[PDB]
Symmetry: C3
């Protein structure tokens, strides 16, 4: 969506640029500037979506640290049970 | 950056209006200057994103480690069920 | 690579702008516009790589969810083992 719109907006701008070099004009210079502005508006919208989406990076990190915490808990529990078993089997 | 980014383009949209209203060599050049300054902010925003994206790779590494540990715990648990089952059957 | 190219491209554009304000001319205005287009084309390529790269955020999330699922499976097993042992040691 954004990138399809982005590269189309740039190809439209590349067309204006060619006409401009073919046929320089105040009207075409201004029209080229307008197209640049509209393209920059799409670049800003694209960056905005990336930033919004980047919030998932933070929540992935938080869940990883929780997972590591739980894994560390399990490890301590597992070391107890090995001691219990060996002790208790050595028992009998 | 985002607030600065969208403000920078709003400023740019104003110049564009004046440009189409009263074209002028001065205003064309001033519009070009504003575009450059806007592009300089776009590049800075992309730079912060790339820097920030390094966290994606470290999240992946930690995930892989977590999966390794979980697989380790798994093999331990299946042996433990064996000893318990066998020990209870012992008696 | 991308961002190294990005800041060079804007450095090139900043110098054109300097010459433009020093010696305005149709040729230099058009040349400035061309440089802007080429810079925008690089901005778009950089965003494209970021979006491609951001797919890793989704795969990290899926793997975390799996890891959490497994941890919850282990947790229930451990509580079963906890009771087996205690009752089996109280047993005798
Ligand atoms: Cl991530």
């Amino acid at each position: 969506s954004h990138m399809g719109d982005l590269k189309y907006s740039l190809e439209r701008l590349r067309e204006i640029l060619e006409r401009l070099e073919e046929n320089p004009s105040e009207k075409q210079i201004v029209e080229a500037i307008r197209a640049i502005v509209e393209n920059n508006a799409q670049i800003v919208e694209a960056i905005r979506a990336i930033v919004e989406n980047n919030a998932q990076i933070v929540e992935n990190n938080r869940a990883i640290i929780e997972a590591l915490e739980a894994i560390g808990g399990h490890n301590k529990i597992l070391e107890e049970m090995k001691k219990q078993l060996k002790d208790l089997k050595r028992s009998l």
